[PDB]
Design an enzyme around this catalytic site. Sequence first.
Site, PDB file in Angstrom:
ATOM      1  CG  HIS A 120      -0.163   0.051   2.534  1.00  0.00           C
ATOM      2  ND1 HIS A 120       0.197  -1.086   3.223  1.00  0.00           N
ATOM      3  CD2 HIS A 120       0.286   1.095   3.271  1.00  0.00           C
ATOM      4  CE1 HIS A 120       0.824  -0.746   4.337  1.00  0.00           C
ATOM      5  NE2 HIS A 120       0.896   0.573   4.390  1.00  0.00           N
ATOM      6  CD  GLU A 145       4.094   5.689   6.043  1.00  0.00           C
ATOM      7  OE1 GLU A 145       4.552   5.241   4.971  1.00  0.00           O
ATOM      8  OE2 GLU A 145       3.346   6.682   6.113  1.00  0.00           O
ATOM      9  CG  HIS A 184       5.154   0.943   2.688  1.00  0.00           C
ATOM     10  ND1 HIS A 184       4.341   1.906   2.132  1.00  0.00           N
ATOM     11  CD2 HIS A 184       4.761   0.812   3.977  1.00  0.00           C
ATOM     12  CE1 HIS A 184       3.495   2.346   3.051  1.00  0.00           C
ATOM     13  NE2 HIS A 184       3.718   1.686   4.172  1.00  0.00           N
ATOM     14  CG  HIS A 213       0.634   5.295   4.404  1.00  0.00           C
ATOM     15  ND1 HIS A 213      -0.567   4.708   4.730  1.00  0.00           N
ATOM     16  CD2 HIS A 213       1.597   4.435   4.809  1.00  0.00           C
ATOM     17  CE1 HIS A 213      -0.343   3.545   5.315  1.00  0.00           C
ATOM     18  NE2 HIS A 213       0.963   3.358   5.379  1.00  0.00           N
TER      19      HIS A 213
END
Lengths: 333, 337
Positions: B64, B71, B110, B66
């Site tokens: 997925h 992150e 990732h 973001h």
Amino acid sequence: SSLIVEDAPDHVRPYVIRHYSHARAVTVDTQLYRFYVTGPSSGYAFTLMGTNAPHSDALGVLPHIHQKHYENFYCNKGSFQLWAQSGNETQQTRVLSSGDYGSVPRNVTHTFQIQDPDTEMTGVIVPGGFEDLFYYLGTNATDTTHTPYIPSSTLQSFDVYAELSFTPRTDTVNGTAPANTVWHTGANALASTAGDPYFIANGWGPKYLNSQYGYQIVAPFVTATQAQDTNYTLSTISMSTTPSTVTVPTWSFPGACAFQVQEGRVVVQIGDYAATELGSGDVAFIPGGVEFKYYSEAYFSKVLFVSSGSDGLDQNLVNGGEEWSSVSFPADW
Amino acid sequence: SSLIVEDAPDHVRPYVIRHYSHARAVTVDTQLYRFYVTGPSSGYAFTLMGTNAPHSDALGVLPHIHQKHYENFYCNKGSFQLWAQSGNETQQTRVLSSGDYGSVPRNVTHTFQIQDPDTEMTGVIVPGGFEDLFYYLGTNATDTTHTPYIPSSSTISTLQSFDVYAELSFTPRTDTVNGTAPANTVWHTGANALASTAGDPYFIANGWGPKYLNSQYGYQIVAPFVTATQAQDTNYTLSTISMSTTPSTVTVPTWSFPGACAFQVQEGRVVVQIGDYAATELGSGDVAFIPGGVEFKYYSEAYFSKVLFVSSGSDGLDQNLVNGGEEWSSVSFPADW
Ligand SMILES: *[C@@H]1O[C@H](CO)[C@@H](O[C@@H]2O[C@H](CO)[C@@H](O[C@@H]3O[C@H](CO)[C@@H](O)[C@H](O)[C@@H]3O)[C@H](O)[C@H]2NC(C)=O)[C@H](O)[C@H]1NC(C)=O
Ligand SMILES: *[C@@H]1O[C@H](CO)[C@@H](O[C@@H]2O[C@H](CO)[C@@H](O[C@@H]3O[C@H](CO)[C@@H](O)[C@H](O)[C@@H]3O)[C@H](O)[C@H]2NC(C)=O)[C@H](O)[C@H]1NC(C)=O
Ligand SMILES: *[C@@H]1O[C@H](CO)[C@@H](O)[C@H](O)[C@H]1NC(C)=O
Ligand SMILES: *[C@@H]1O[C@H](CO)[C@@H](O)[C@H](O)[C@H]1NC(C)=O
Ligand SMILES: *[C@@H]1O[C@H](CO)[C@@H](O)[C@H](O)[C@H]1NC(C)=O
Ligand SMILES: *[C@@H]1O[C@H](CO)[C@@H](O)[C@H](O)[C@H]1NC(C)=O
Ligand SMILES: *[C@@H]1O[C@H](CO)[C@@H](O)[C@H](O)[C@H]1NC(C)=O
Ligand SMILES: *[C@@H]1O[C@H](CO)[C@@H](O)[C@H](O)[C@H]1NC(C)=O
Ligand SMILES: CCN(CC)C(=S)S
Ligand SMILES: CCN(CC)C(=S)S
Ligand SMILES: [Cu+2]
Ligand SMILES: [Cu+2]
């Protein structure tokens, strides 16, 4: 005479020595050696040493054998490669990272190579007194700031025998050779008998859960099977906190024992000394015949534990526990 | 009342939360998540979570992206594999072991996979509040004994509202060798540089990234993980700070910065004094949180300590120490003061 000392005592007594204390430090080239437990301090039961070193493109020592000492290699942090061979058995090599363990019985050819910049190798050698070799070949180090390391054959009497015919194998893949081995990809067993080297990757060896005093998980590294006449045990012990309704047990063993905290916060109360909390890399030494209590202040702690005799703390917890398949203890008491 | 808390507070205040505290724990399958720093506890500055899990033969999460969160993956112990790809660039993957770091900027595909039995992944996400996703995916865990982990269409819309965008066509590469792919990469065998291009993932193996030595208050070594170059508008820094003891002739400095900051001890014993609270000594995995504008002091009781440090803003503690220091090529500090 206080419990906490900067160098291991010159006679047997309870003590605690903090990580990176002077501990009669010496350097051998780029490596810095510390002697947390010595022959004199343990009554010759065992030696517990720490070696800190930067990456090297070369072997850390020429291949050799010890005929009267059993060495145990534990990776505190970083990573180093270890090569080992017994007799004409196939030569084995593993790259050890944090928490990994390598067993090198007497008469096993070995050498190592430091891989990562912040590498720390904890060595447990039985019997004690082997450290003389490192005093001898080493250069005294004052190391005023206590920095982990400094930024930058004829030794038969010390029980070192050269093995110039040994060629460390170079077919390493995914941290192991030869290819038909298990390393960080599956369970590792201790050797079936004494004399053979073996390796246990962090969390992949056999474990036992003891629920008598809170939860403790023993992961044996050396048992009577492998130690035989060297007469010791070695393992990690992981610990939960002790429930308020459970009395922290007092222990008193025939032989000396010691532990080095790897993770967490462990309180030790030895003899008539104050309860003292140990953190990463700190070492506690308890002479045989001296009463002590320990418990984990952290919710989970893990220590590297060594004991002289066949019925030390780790074996006692194993015998009073059950086989267990996890590095974690049950979620409920 | 007490600097130490068992769960992150529901508002901003100085606190310390011990390793493996309940921390509003949830489980997602075999994984146990603890929320040491949350949106409410950090004033939405950042999230700091711990994920403990056993080996798995399957991906730990479907691949997925973001779009609005950055992150940071830090391996406390054990090992996990991480895959990452920015747009049309070559897909990168590394196996992280203790002390290793992985950077995942916004818009980077990732996923990860837990490799070792005692694995712990510290996630630092900016901005804060991202944890709501795990409150949804996860099931509350009482975990009375504080054990690290428990032994043995419709969603499409829901996930997007949590800033999670699935990448179904993404196939994690399967040609890993010595913990890395593709072949022309550096992993535990040489220096790792922070990505010079914003938006690109990058990885730093333990001790192989750039470092700076600060000698103003004893010796401290900063190893930057995220700088302005990479953070951009997410406006934060991330690094590890290694510390010597403070000599008796040196005054432990008092710090205050506009943005909230926090640290998790990795190695050693670090005493923290925040605001008008009593000084407290932290050990392995313990987390300290300092609100922006609050004065604090810290020093190492251990001869060597190392912490993972995050700060909201461009000029927090780590950047300050760097600016007051010099380039350094060792993980150890000098043997003489
Ligand atoms: C994965 O990493 C391992 C190290 O853990 C690499 O092993 C190394 O392989 C190289 C090249 O084969 C070896 O260097 C060569 O050794 C031969 C034999 O002495 C020599 O003739 C060559 O001149 C060269 O120096 C090296 O010894 C070896 N290291 C170890 C510890 O085994 C392996 O190549 C890596 N695999 C990949 C695909 O990256
Ligand atoms: C060194 O260790 C790595 C793992 O880090 C091994 O890589 C693994 O290789 C296998 C077989 O090539 C891959 O499994 C295969 O995946 C394909 C595609 O999904 C599938 O068609 C096959 O049925 C099989 O499942 C595995 O995914 C891959 N793992 C990773 C993470 O890359 C590598 O083989 C090891 N090398 C040696 C010499 O031991
Ligand atoms: C080690 O080898 C030496 C020399 O061959 C031999 O005398 C000794 O018995 C061996 N020791 C053990 C414990 O096998
Ligand atoms: C080794 O000990 C000698 C004699 O006390 C001392 O003068 C010297 O500085 C020491 N060397 C180091 C590197 O600490
Ligand atoms: C093994 O060690 C224990 C504890 O030190 C000691 O009491 C015992 O005598 C040893 N056994 C042998 C056969 O040496
Ligand atoms: C991420 O991708 C989205 C969707 O394509 C785009 O709207 C946005 O500008 C990107 N964000 C960043 C920070 O690059
Ligand atoms: C899970 O815990 C959260 C936070 O305390 C709580 O709000 C929520 O209702 C809990 N879920 C259940 C089903 O109890
Ligand atoms: C970055 O964060 C700091 C500290 O919270 C804040 O003072 C500053 O205004 C922020 N800058 C931007 C561009 O948001
Ligand atoms: C320096 C490592 N070592 C001590 C464990 C030997 S090679 S015996
Ligand atoms: C659970 C790991 N993680 C949080 C850092 C993502 S996949 S976003
Ligand atoms: Cu040796
Ligand atoms: Cu994600």
